[PDB]
Ligand binder design. Sequence first.
Ligand SMILES: C[C@@](O)(CCS)CC(=O)O
Ligand SMILES: C[C@@](O)(CCS)CC(=O)O
Lengths: 373, 376
Amino acid sequence: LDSRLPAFRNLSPAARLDHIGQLLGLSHDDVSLLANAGALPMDIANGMIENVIGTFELPYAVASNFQINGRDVLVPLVVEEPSIVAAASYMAKLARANGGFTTSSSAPLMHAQVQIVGIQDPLNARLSLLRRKDEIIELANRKDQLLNSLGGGCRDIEVHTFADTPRGPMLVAHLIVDVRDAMGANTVNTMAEAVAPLMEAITGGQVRLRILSNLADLRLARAQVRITPQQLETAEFSGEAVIEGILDAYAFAAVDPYRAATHNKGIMNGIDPLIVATGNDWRAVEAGAHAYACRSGHYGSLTTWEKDNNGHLVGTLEMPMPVGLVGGATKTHPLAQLSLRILGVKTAQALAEIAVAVGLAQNLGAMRALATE
Amino acid sequence: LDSRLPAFRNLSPAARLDHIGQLLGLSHDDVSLLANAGALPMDIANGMIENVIGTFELPYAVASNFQINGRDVLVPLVVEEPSIVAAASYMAKLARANGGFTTSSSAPLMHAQVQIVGIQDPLNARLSLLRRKDEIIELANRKDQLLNSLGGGCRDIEVHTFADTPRGPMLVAHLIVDVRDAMGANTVNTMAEAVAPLMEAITGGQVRLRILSNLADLRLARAQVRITPQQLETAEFSGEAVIEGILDAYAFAAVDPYRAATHNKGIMNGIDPLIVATGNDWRAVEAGAHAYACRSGHYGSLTTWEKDNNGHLVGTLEMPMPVGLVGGATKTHPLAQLSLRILGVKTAQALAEIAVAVGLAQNLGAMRALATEGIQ
Ligand SMILES: C[C@@](O)(CCS)CC(=O)O
Ligand SMILES: C[C@@](O)(CCS)CC(=O)O
């Protein structure tokens, strides 16, 4: 695949679609899903959420130029705000000259929290749970034998205590679960329910909340980009000056939460539209992103920007990225399925890696604009 | 208006739309917007964002039972996830018995940041700016006198310094701007560009970034809700026990960021779909929400939950809520316009107040469900 698409921004929607269809070898019927309104039929919409009276459209666009680990990728995006798609495509174009985006990710690990109350000895109870961790993990896995056959499953437990809260002592167990190609909520919640009676028997306490954590800090996706001074030169500014300007902008975000919020918002401008396009839960991605940004006790920037030993601008984005190819609405929405086909992703972590690449590209575009104005 | 909508959940989408139309007295044109697919014309969609190849639908629903400061309101919501609309509606139903939701909000005040570098004396330059505050404010208000006449405009400036960063000393001025019915990005960005040469002249430094802050902590919206033990009783638990369970869940969110992230995610399950339904920018609302949640140096719960002196469960939500009735897709999307018609909102702050009421209801619904689920 070649993702460049010259003159794409100036073609009509119909011509853009026909071009995409030809590039990907989409069927006439697949193309029909975008060529005509109503790809989400009312019986599907009515079964997705409650009190439905119709559907609501946002534009469906494709960003060009993206290249991930040497392979060109076309990126569908659904959003209402101008400039996002153009900035994504243009920054991807610059990235291409220097090898594109380089990405990696952790295993798709999610936390299931099991909150325990009603015991006077939470610190002791924690050791009781750890002593019997194998038994707990085995019980969790008995509950989802298919997942284990697919290469996922409960891998570990960790246990945290809050001995002094205004509501008394609490213990919180985390199941650490490989969820393969799911976002993971229903998967881990089910395991949390399954282990609850055993945890009560072990601790002598009362289980309260059984629920995933959206602070998915064991499910990280990583992206790198490199830009040379030559690429950033303007009529007004030399490329070296622009790079220094960008580093100044980054330092500003790193110290001032008023700037970091806006800086990170820019990243999410790139990410959320891909989440929507793939039928994924954007609230979950947002919560993981912003909570991770303040894990140090200070709300800072999700990206980093530096100058390497060669004087080149180098950027990173590492953040939680819980997304699915299966589960939720990723299967139910015919256009979510088409998006996955366009992307060509075969695992959820592959989708996660594309997400962070697009987030990094958007942040680069935002700061290049702010540093050159 | 009566927002109770009996049996709404079980009616057909067509019958639901008819009942809404009757209640609001919607025109034929308005009803036809939702009855046929493709309400967003491709010409409009193509002008909204770049590289458009089609459109993407999400379900469009209406939450029932909401009441804001004694007035019933219907709430449109666009989202993919089940249980949200039902939970919102059911919690709103319970809220009604005790006076519904009570809301307030600050003026629609947004920050424009002006970053200045390369000053050898940033602390001194800060005082130079403050001495000439009125002069700066006057210049900011020069271009848009329509905004001033509508009761908006630059109200104040604050100046902050970061004298020791790895890239040298930085001075950051904030223009504090009343943006009336806009989210405010265009308004404040324009003012920030306008005052920049004057700030350079005063400080002797170089202006770099001129940009709104999404941490809109001067644009707060507030909601309150009250629920009695009687309303929360289940087959297994007394209402009193359920209230204690909810308070335990709240304390858990207040101490553990792994819980707080999920707890706040639930709030945003309520809010974001209303933001989408009104053509507004949900990334802006998300960033303001979560950054505000950590302002104290610990990422905590946006809501609060307490038991009052009568033993009633009382909840609050106060958070940044920058939204518009004008600008971009809010204007150009026919269904964003329909959503505003359904809501009946006359100011952006009124929309903000409904947003926090829905966020508060959603959090309550989530905690109630988690607190009442039996151990298997
Ligand atoms: C340009 C930006 O505000 C997003 C526009 S909605 C992000 C940033 O400031 O870095
Ligand atoms: C139930 C909840 O996870 C949202 C479902 S997406 C929120 C919460 O845990 O309070």
